[PDB]
From a paper:
To explore how AmGSTF1 can be regulated by chemical inhibitors, a series of crystal structures of the native protein was determined. The hexagonal modification contained one protein chain in the asymmetric unit, whereas the rhombohedral form had six independent molecules with a very similar packing arrangement of trimers composed of the functional GST dimer. All polypeptide chains adopted virtually identical overall structures, with rmsds ranging from 0.2–0.4 Å on Cα-atoms. In both crystal modifications, the four residues preceding this loop, (Cys120-Leu121-Phe122-Asn123), were found to project into the monomer subunit of a symmetry-related chain, effectively blocking the active site of the adjacent subunit. This arrangement explains why no ligands were found to be bound in either the G- or the H-site of this open-loop apo-structure, with both loops being flexible and presumably closing upon ligand binding.
In black-grass, upregulation of a phi (F)-class GST1 (AmGSTF1) has been shown to be a functional biomarker of MHR. Recombinant AmGSTF1 has been shown to exhibit both glutathione-S-transferase activity toward xenobiotics, as well as acting as a GPOX, reducing fatty-acid hydroperoxides to less reactive monohydroxy derivatives. The Phi (F) class GSTs, of which AmGSTF1 is an example, are found in all higher plants, being homodimeric enzymes in which each protomer of approximately 23–30 kDa with the catalytic serine residues located at the interface.
Numbering used by the authors:
A (entry chain AAA), B (entry chain AAA): 3 to 37, 50 to 123, 138 to 218
The structure:
Amino acid sequence: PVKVFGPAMSTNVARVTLCLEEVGAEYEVVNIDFNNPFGQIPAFQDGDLLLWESRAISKYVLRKYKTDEVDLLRESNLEEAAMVDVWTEVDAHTYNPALSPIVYQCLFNESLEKLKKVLEVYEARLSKHSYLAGDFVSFADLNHFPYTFYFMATPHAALFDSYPHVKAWWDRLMARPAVKKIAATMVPPK
Amino acid sequence: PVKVFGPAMSTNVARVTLCLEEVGAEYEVVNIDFNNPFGQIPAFQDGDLLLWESRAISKYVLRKYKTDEVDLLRESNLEEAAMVDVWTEVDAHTYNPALSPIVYQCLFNESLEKLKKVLEVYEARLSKHSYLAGDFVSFADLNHFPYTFYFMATPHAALFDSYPHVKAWWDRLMARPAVKKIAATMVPPK
């Protein structure tokens, strides 16, 4: 059984726990307090192996537990793997940064016009394909879950109704058993 | 022959051209002017395939042209691939951002104390291993080339002399024939 160290509700921990659930790995989430050379969270233990960097942890999980039924990187198919990589990068560089300040300014404390231009592109893409990388769910889709989840707790949630293919894609991810399981974990400690 | 569209000297184009040279692919670099749905540069054509996102382009290049002698992702070995991923992410999230404002404030126009703390970590890592992911060159090392190249044009270049293992690792990358070739291309158009 592998161990994830960090807060359950953080977007970087939820990205790893979502990957562990999609592949059906046995794992434990452990809270750690600061009181792994850059001392980052999440950290990840598998036997003597210690990893950090949410995306590197996630890919290790998706490769280690890969099957014919759950192949979420598609590394056996050059062009599928490329489309998974492209939309993973779009999530990191374009999408998550368009969401982030709406989430932060709405749940604590102009970005709407930039997000709409991004959703136009997603709407075109999800009109031609079931999921971002093609006609199969992949890491690219799962990477969109944690930030969109919090965006859907804001008063801007309904913005997705103007992008019917994006709304349908979002609802489809939200129906996945692994996504429902990780949604329920994304709460402050009790 | 594949085509890379963008400025030769940009860090994101040089990352792709360095990968194409390390695998010995036939390619052409094409300048494009704005006068690929988010219209990003570099863009990449391989037959009917059009890609964007420097890192996704790079990985497609490293997989398409992979051999026994030039395996720069190590996707066949779970833990090696994980260490390549970890240090690729360290480059994106920690290293390149520590260099960037030193490069920008020195060649145009506090970050030194943060860079030193990062170089301490790199020095420890490169004391135990030849290269960042283990005893083999990988994408993780190549990702460090473009920004470090520009950092070495600043008056802070000599900072690496305080980190002898980092200096030796840097000199070793600079001696690679592919790196020398791409260093020479990183000039303004003539």
